[PDB]
Amino acid sequence: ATQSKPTPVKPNYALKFTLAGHTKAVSSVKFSPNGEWLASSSADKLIKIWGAYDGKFEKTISGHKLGISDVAWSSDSNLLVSASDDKTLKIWDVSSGKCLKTLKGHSNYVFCCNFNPQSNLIVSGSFDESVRIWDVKTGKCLKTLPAHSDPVSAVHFNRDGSLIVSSSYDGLCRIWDTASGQCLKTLIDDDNPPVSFVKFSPNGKYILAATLDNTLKLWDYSKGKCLKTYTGHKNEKYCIFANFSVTGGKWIVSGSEDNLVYIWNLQTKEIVQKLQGHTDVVISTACHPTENIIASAALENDKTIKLWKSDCGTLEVLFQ
Amino acid sequence: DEEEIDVVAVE
Known part of the structure; x- marks a missing residue:
């Protein structure tokens, strides 16, 4: 038997740290896979690295010519890739802060990026409606997927790296075979709101x-079937990340345009907590890989990142 | 009803 954190009926996340230092809107925050670092990207063209447990500022990574919309870690926590309004992605060596490769190909802003699990590949999506697969070791573009007819808002590899999922303002989710680039599946709903x-x-x-x-x-x-729906928050304008939280119970976590962090019971769809303290739109949230820690970041009128932790929670107790 | 979604299980 392994040590697995308890699964309460409702978590109890409390604010522990607030991290100030970006000078414009923060666009994304991500925990390193090894659990030691938190990376943030911002419209001020900077990446900042912070300690995951204490929020202590570690270093600033610079060189993009315009604002950054996304950042993503390699699997060994040694590299980062960023996506910038300057139409490039850059690969960084985290310990030294040096840009190893600039990936150019996109015709407009790069909005989203991710390493595959093996971390020899990078996928990215752009305002230019395309999805690109890049080679980490050489920095050349392997494929360009004609993915969508509007900006691409997110791209992600699955657990073994054989599939990429993409989303766009055109209202579609598509799944691509990494090896071939073939579109395997298009998800459509009764209606097609921007994704x-x-x-x-x-x-x-x-x-x-x-x-x-x-x-x-x-x-x-x-099956291409929608199995669960989560509502109650505000998201009509911004590309707000959402998360699976799985260290404590099984929750969905997302930011919101009403300045709160929402947490849903994955299975029942009920809201189980709303974290208050941010003072502007919560644009990005992220969940620590092994501890019950949530990082949240907010837009220009706030500009801070918050670390929340839940060690306890509500339990149901049968008296008899 | 209410089949329990398992999002972490490796099958």
């Missing part, structure tokens, strides 16, 4: 999608 975010579940079987109609949906990937 502002998508990602695979940790086991690769479901995809979680955000639409600009204040809705999160969990889709069965094989």
Whole structure:
């Protein structure tokens, strides 16, 4: 038997740290896979690295010519890739802060990026409606996918790196075979609101999608069926990341345009907590890989990142 | 009803 954190009926996340230092809107925050670092990207063209447990500022990574919309870690936590309004991605060596490769090909802003699990590949999506697969070791573009007819808002590899899921303002989610670039599947709903975010579940079987109609949906990937819907927050404008939280119970976590962090019971769809303290739109949230820690970041009128932790929670107790 | 979604299980 292994040590697995308790699964309460409702978590109890409390604010522990607030991290100030970006000078413009923060666009994304991500925990390193080894659990030691938190990376943030911002419209001020900077990446900042912070300690995951204490929020202590570690270093600033610079060189992009315009603002950054996304950042993503390699699997060994040694590299980062960023996507910038300057139409490039850059690969960084985290310990030294040096740009190893600039990936150019996109015709407009790069909005989203991710390493594949093996971390020899990078996928990216652009305002230019395309999805690109890049070679990390050489920095050349392997494929360009004619993915969508509007900006691409998110791209993500599944658990074994054989599939990429993409989303776009055109209202579509598509799944691509990495090896061939073939579109294997297009997800369409009764209606086609812009899709502002998508990602695979940790086991690769479901995809979680955000639409600009204040809705999160969990889709069965094989069947192309929507299995769960999550509402109650505000998301009509911004590309707000959403997360699977799995260290404590099984929750969906997302930011919101009403300045709060929302947490849903994955299975029942009920809101189980709303974290208050941010003072502007919560644009990005992320969940620590092993601890019950949530990082949240907010837009220009706030500009801070918050670390929340839940060690306890509500338990149901049968008296008899 | 209410089949329990398992999003972490490796099958």
